[PDB]
Amino acid sequence: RPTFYRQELNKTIWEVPERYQNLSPVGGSVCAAFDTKTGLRVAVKKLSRPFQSIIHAKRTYRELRLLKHMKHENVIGLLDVFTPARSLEEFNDVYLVTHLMGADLNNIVKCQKLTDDHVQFLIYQILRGLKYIHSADIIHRDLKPSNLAVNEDCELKILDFGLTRWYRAPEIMLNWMHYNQTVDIWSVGCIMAELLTGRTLFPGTDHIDQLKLILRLVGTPGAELLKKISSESARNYIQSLTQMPKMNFANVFIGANPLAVDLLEKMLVLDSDKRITAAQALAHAYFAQYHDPDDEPVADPYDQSFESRDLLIDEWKSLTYDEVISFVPPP
Numbered sequence: 204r205p206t207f208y209r210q211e212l213n214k215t216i217w218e219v220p221e222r223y224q225n226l227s228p229v230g231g232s233v234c235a236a237f238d239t240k241t242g243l244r245v246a247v248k249k250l251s252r253p254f255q256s257i258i259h260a261k262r263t264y265r266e267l268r269l270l271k272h273m274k275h276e277n278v279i280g281l282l283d284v285f286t287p288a289r290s291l292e293e294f295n296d297v298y299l300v301t302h303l304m305g306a307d308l309n310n311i312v313k314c315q316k317l318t319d320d321h322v323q324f325l326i327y328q329i330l331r332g333l334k335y336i337h338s339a340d341i342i343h344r345d346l347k348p349s350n351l352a353v354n355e356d357c358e359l360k361i362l363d364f365g366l367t368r369w370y371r372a373p374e375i376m377l378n379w380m381h382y383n384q385t386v387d388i389w390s391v392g393c394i395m396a397e398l399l400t401g402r403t404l405f406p407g408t409d410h411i412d413q414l415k416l417i418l419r420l421v422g423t424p425g426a427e428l429l430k431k432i433s434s435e436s437a438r439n440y441i442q443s444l445t446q447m448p449k450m451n452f453a454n455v456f457i458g459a460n461p462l463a464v465d466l467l468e469k470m471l472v473l474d475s476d477k478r479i480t481a482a483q484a485l486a487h488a489y490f491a492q493y494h495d496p497d498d499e500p501v502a503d504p505y506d507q508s509f510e511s512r513d514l515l516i517d518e519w520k521s522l523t524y525d526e527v528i529s530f531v532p533p534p
């Protein structure tokens with residue numbers, strides 16, 4: 204056990220090892236810090252109320268398990284995980300540490316008007332990280348520019364997976380019974396469109412508005428999609444929405460690389476069964492200059508059987524404690 208010093212960052216008490224100096228809030232709570240062990244800037248996240256409820260306890264365990272499993276260049280991974288506690292009894296706080304990239308994609312789009320090459324590299328990396336995430340049978344579920352950290356060389360890492368409404372898949376704007384991994388592809392589509400235009404694709408004011416804007420672009424469900432709607436009332440709620448014809452993306456994203464438009468058409472399909480997968484997208488001609496089938500790795504099997512179980516708070520906290528102790532830092 205290293206030396207743990209205390210500090211106060213905005214009404215919040217922070218107890219971390221001495222290797223972590225210069226804590227600075229960046230906004231659980233997160234603080235930027237200097238790792239005197241590597242000389243690099245890191246992001247330290249202190250979970251709020253880790254074990255306040257069963258749901259909170261399970262979520263804490265979930266996040267720790269996820270982060271400990273992710274080992275990919277384009278996915279946030281764990282540099283360290285610690286707790287001031289010295290035993291299971293005092294165990295009450297969880298701190299996670301990872302690379303601090305510099306900025307998020309949201310900030311990059313604000314100022315800089317990205318070139319086609321930029322959007323190729325950026326989207327390529329997101330898909331490369333996604334292929335890895337999806338290979339572990341994990342769904343991000345909330346991909347958006349603020350969840351994408353980028354460094355000075357525009358290298359990217361995906362944050363907060365497996366845990367605005369502008370990038371959410373239409374099926375997840377409805378409580379459609381069990382969605383697949385392509386909900387993440389829909390999000391990538393929305394992100395790509397925005398990196399290309401500099402404008403939000405579907406900037407809905409609220410829930411209803413969001414769906415209306417999506418339908419104006421991709422049109423109302425065709426016959427083939429309708430045939431798969433098991434719910435009768437949901438089937439009418441669809442047709443009750445103004446009939447919208449599918450827009451030709453070429454006429455929407457004027458001046459964009461034709462291959463970019465083609466890819467967007469394959470990601471922004473209303474029917475999730477017809478959406479391009481991450482692996483397929485990586486082989487699309489749009490990424491010819493970045494694609495390397497021998498350098499787009501997949502993950503080791505991820506045991507997530509814990510998701511189906513209902514345990515007591517102390518049980519979830521004990522399991523979380525076990526994961527903290529069993530942690531082996533990167534090379």
Ligand SMILES: O=C(NCc1ccccn1)c1ccc(Oc2ccccc2)cc1
Binds near residue numbers: 363
């Ligand atoms: O680089 C990040 N964002 C880009 C960024 C914003 C401001 C200054 C420097 N870098 C970042 C990394 C980790 C974060 O939270 C954590 C997630 C998992 C584990 C530990 C922290 C939050 C932001």
Ligand SMILES: CCCCCCCCO[C@H]1O[C@@H](CO)[C@@H](O)[C@H](O)[C@@H]1O
Binds near residue numbers: 377381431473
């Ligand atoms: C109705 C218009 C807005 C919602 C369109 C959602 C289209 C979803 O598309 C798909 O979703 C998956 C289930 O989640 C598939 O299994 C379904 O069969 C369906 O094809």
